[PDB]
Amino acid sequence: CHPCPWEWTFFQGNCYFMSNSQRNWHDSITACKEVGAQLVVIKSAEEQNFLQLQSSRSNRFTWMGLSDLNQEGTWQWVDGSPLLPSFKQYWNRGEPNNVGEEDCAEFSGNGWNDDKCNLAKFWICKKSAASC
Ligand SMILES: OC[C@H]1O[C@H](OC[C@H]2CCCNC2)[C@@H](n2cc(-c3ccccc3)nn2)[C@@H](O)[C@@H]1O
Ligand SMILES: [Ca+2]
Ligand SMILES: [Ca+2]
Ligand SMILES: [Ca+2]
Helix, strand or coil: CCCCCCEEEEEEEEEECCCCCCCCHHHHHHHHHHCCCCCCCCCCHHHHHHHHHHHHHHHCCCCEEECCHHHCCCCCEEECCCCCCEEEEEEECCCCCCCCCCCCCCCCCCCEECCCCCCCCEEEEEEEECCC
């Protein structure tokens, strides 16, 4: 028994996978569903730091499961949960700025950016670990 599939990273009871290819935001959602996972929904500050460190180290602009597609300026996770005020700190300086209509969130440098959902980026999937 092992908690996560091969090539997935265990962190605090969940399993994470960073892609090696690039897709747009909606196709990244589909990619995670196909492996029994979800485009990453962040639930804690420690989880944010863990994910941001990997995006920063790898120098990969990476989608997360967050959008303001339903209501411009109101950010919602793909599981329906709202972006809480304790997470506004992670936006990069000047973000979100919706320049040229940007409705999907990415890890970019040290924080988050809103970018065009049609752009191809890396993505991270998350699913719960098995108990061994
Ligand atoms: O336009 C894509 C992103 O360009 C920059 O971010 C860098 C990219 C690098 C590739 C991965 N995504 C992040 C940031 N930017 C653009 C502008 C801006 C403002 C007014 C007029 C013209 C441009 N201000 N800031 C982000 O806000 C943008 O979303
Ligand atoms: Ca919009
Ligand atoms: Ca927007
Ligand atoms: Ca932006």
